[PDB]
Amino acid sequence: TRDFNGTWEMESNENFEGYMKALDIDFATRKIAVRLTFTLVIDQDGDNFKCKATSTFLNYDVDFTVGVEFDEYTKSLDNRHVKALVTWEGDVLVCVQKGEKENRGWKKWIEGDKLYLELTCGDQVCRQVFKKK
Ligand SMILES: *C/C=C/c1cc2ccc(N(CC)CC)cc2oc1=O
């Protein structure tokens, strides 16, 4: 299924610390943020996505259309400009964020009935798993 709609509650978070370090997030924001549990609210209609990730300290909002390149200013994270593009590889949603970081982006898929989110920057990979509320 290609249908990521819903409210998704974190059940596991692996190596968020390495992902944020590869982004050069400052120590005190990082040290707080690696403790956090996240909730995802995804609204998906065809190509049109609206995503909202929330925690007690870090929030991240993105809206995009599959197949349409867009500019992203990662204000809530590392404060960089990237050229982002989200496309389908089979049933995996793939985002590439072109900028000064290599292999920066993410991949999302459903396995069974959970949502998997893989965050990449440089040589670091973070894996998060969510359950549909
Ligand atoms: C449905 C895909 C949108 C989406 C992708 C995300 C990428 C990165 C992040 N974080 C915080 C965990 C790092 C910047 C969150 C996120 O959530 C989403 O809903």
Swiss-Prot record:
Q: Which example biological process does GO assign this protein?
A: epidermis development
Binding-site list for all-trans-retinol: 40, 108
**InterPro entries (UniProt xref):** Calycin, Fatty_acid-bd, ILBP, Lipocln_cytosolic_FA-bd_dom
Superkingdom as given in the UniProt entry:
Eukaryota
Where is this gene product found?
A: Cytoplasm
Query: What Gene Ontology terms describe where this protein resides (cellular component)?
Result: cytosol; nucleus
Q: Which Pfam families match?
A: Lipocalin (PF00061)
Q: In which tissues is it expressed?
A: Higher expression in adult small intestine and to a much lesser extent in fetal kidney.
A GO molecular function held by the record: retinoid binding
Alphabetically ordered keywords of this record: Cytoplasm, Retinol-binding, Transport, Vitamin A
PANTHER family in alphabetical order: FATTY ACID BINDING PROTEIN (PTHR11955)
UniProt remark on domains: Forms a beta-barrel structure that accommodates hydrophobic ligands in its interior.
Q: Which family does it belong to?
A: Belongs to the calycin superfamily. Fatty-acid binding protein (FABP) family.
The protein's name in its UniProt record: Retinol-binding protein 2
Organism equals Homo sapiens
